[PDB]
Design a protein around this ligand. Structure first.
Ligand SMILES: N=C(N)NCCCCNC(=O)c1csc(-c2cscn2)n1
Ligand SMILES: N=C(N)NCCCCNC(=O)c1csc(-c2cscn2)n1
Lengths: 255, 255
DNA sequence: ATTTAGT
DNA sequence: TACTAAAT
DNA sequence: ATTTAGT
DNA sequence: TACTAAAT
């Protein structure tokens, strides 16, 4: 009955997240960078029709906003299965080349897992939903990620850009991991007996007994929801002794 | 007038050479070797007509003799310039693979030249003619190099083989260099004031004054001819201060 | 004629 | 993933 | 659509 | 010396 205990913490009930304690992110550019504006490649109606609903949802949620910017990168129509449905995938490579590099602080899954003590057998795995979108972008950095969006049927002006940390941006993973580490620091101090591994949006809480787990989990959920993040209730693996995290299978603490 | 002083030493006058002091060479095979007999590839009349005179000359000189052997390698028709004339080139690669390896004792031209003192400025360069053919092959090793030779116009039996060290045989260069070193040892002891470099068939005698050179050269020629070797009178560079040896140009002793 | 070693 | 080029 | 990294 | 295959 976890769903009914933490509506704010779940994506299926708390709505879109927004990390209220995190200041809007400023993205520093390299010393020699100037705006790059690559024109939108013509897109078929089929792809444009597939992509449309996603953009509208994003504008509605305010994750995307109209803007005029000297920066512009191409939106790409992508779909995984055969026919499948199209989804927007922005080509931010030229933006990435002009953005100052930051130290990669996210540890590889292998090393991250070696920090799990044999005693802690009870697990809980959460996957934050739309993690990056929870992080805001400073208005000064927003123009950087603009792209063209023309609707052949009464098309909104021309460009749109993100008000949240975007997908495709080389530093998003690291910036999200660090921001979340800042927000979960207090939680860590309040529960020294718990083991929490963070891999960007993939979380693993390891306790010692079904009790500490249910108590630590409720605390973690309550903390996450309170901060503005949202977990997938669907893929949630709560208080178990065998979970699937970062590809590995943690049974009796072996993998 | 060197020609008239040493008829025995020159190829253009002394006839074919034959190292009288060198015992017929025995060629040891590797421990697991058995005869290999590759059939002769059909040869065009044009090539066969070109090659014929050479084989006849060789049979006449006794350098080639009829034989029946479990060994056989293909004779190849080769010519350098455009139309050019064909000359026999035996493919002895399969024979080479079955012949025991010997230490490579011939020094590279670079190292060989570093053994020339700055004081010795007078040079004399000789190139032995048909050097390998001067070395005999023990009758027990002769069968090893057999090849097929059929004459569409009354063809001599079938196979022929060499009675001298052959071309194409991987160890010929080294075996010739060593054999010649054995024969020129005494000469070296009789002329300690002379510098003699040996690179298989390419010889360089370095003295100090036009006198020691003319005296050393006459001695060397007389010794070479006496032993059965023959030098090319045509390409001979006698008592000079600037000669062409092993590719380099030795002027004032620089290259 | 075949093999090797490179491009 | 092929056509040289050389060497016997 | 472009780029990269391999085969 | 080309056609994948992936990744944005
Ligand atoms: N393992 C296998 N089954 N391989 C089969 C065929 C390999 C062919 N490689 C080339 O043609 C090649 C390589 S470099 C090159 C080349 C050409 S002009 C300048 N460089 N051509
Ligand atoms: N410097 C230049 N101007 N280069 C021009 C063209 C190079 C082409 N390389 C291949 O096709 C290649 C290499 S490996 C390979 C391959 C194929 S199927 C399995 N492996 N194909």
């Amino acid at each position: 009955t976890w769903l009914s205990d933490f509506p704010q913490a779940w994506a299926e009930t708390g709505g879109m997240g927004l990390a209220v304690r995190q200041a809007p992110l400023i993205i520093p550019l390299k010393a020699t960078s100037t705006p790059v504006s690559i024109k939108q490649y013509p897109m078929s109606q089929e792809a444009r029709l597939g992509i449309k609903p996603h953009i509208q949802r994003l504008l509605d949620q305010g994750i995307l906003v109209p803007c005029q910017s000297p920066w512009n990168t191409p939106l790409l129509p992508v779909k995984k299965p055969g026919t499948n449905d199209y989804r927007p995938v922005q080509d931010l490579r030229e933006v990435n080349k002009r953005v100052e590099d930051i130290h990669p602080t996210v540890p590889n899954p292998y090393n991250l897992l070696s920090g799990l003590p044999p005693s802690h057998q009870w697990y809980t795995v959460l996957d934050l939903k739309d993690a990056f979108f929870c992080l805001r972008l400073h208005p000064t950095s927003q123009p950087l990620f603009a792209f063209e969006w023309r609707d052949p049927e009464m098309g909104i002006s021309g460009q749109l850009t993100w008000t949240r940390l975007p997908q495709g941006f080389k530093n998003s993973p690291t910036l999200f991991d660090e921001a979340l580490h800042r927000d979960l620091a207090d939680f860590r101090i309040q529960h020294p007996d718990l083991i929490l591994l963070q891999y960007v949006d993939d979380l693993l809480l390891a306790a010692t007994s079904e009790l500490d787990c249910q108590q630590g989990t409720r605390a973690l959920l309550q903390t996450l929801g309170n901060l503005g993040y949202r977990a997938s209730a669907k893929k949630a693996q709560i208080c178990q002794k065998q979970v699937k995290y970062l590809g590995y299978l943690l049974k009796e603490g072996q993998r």
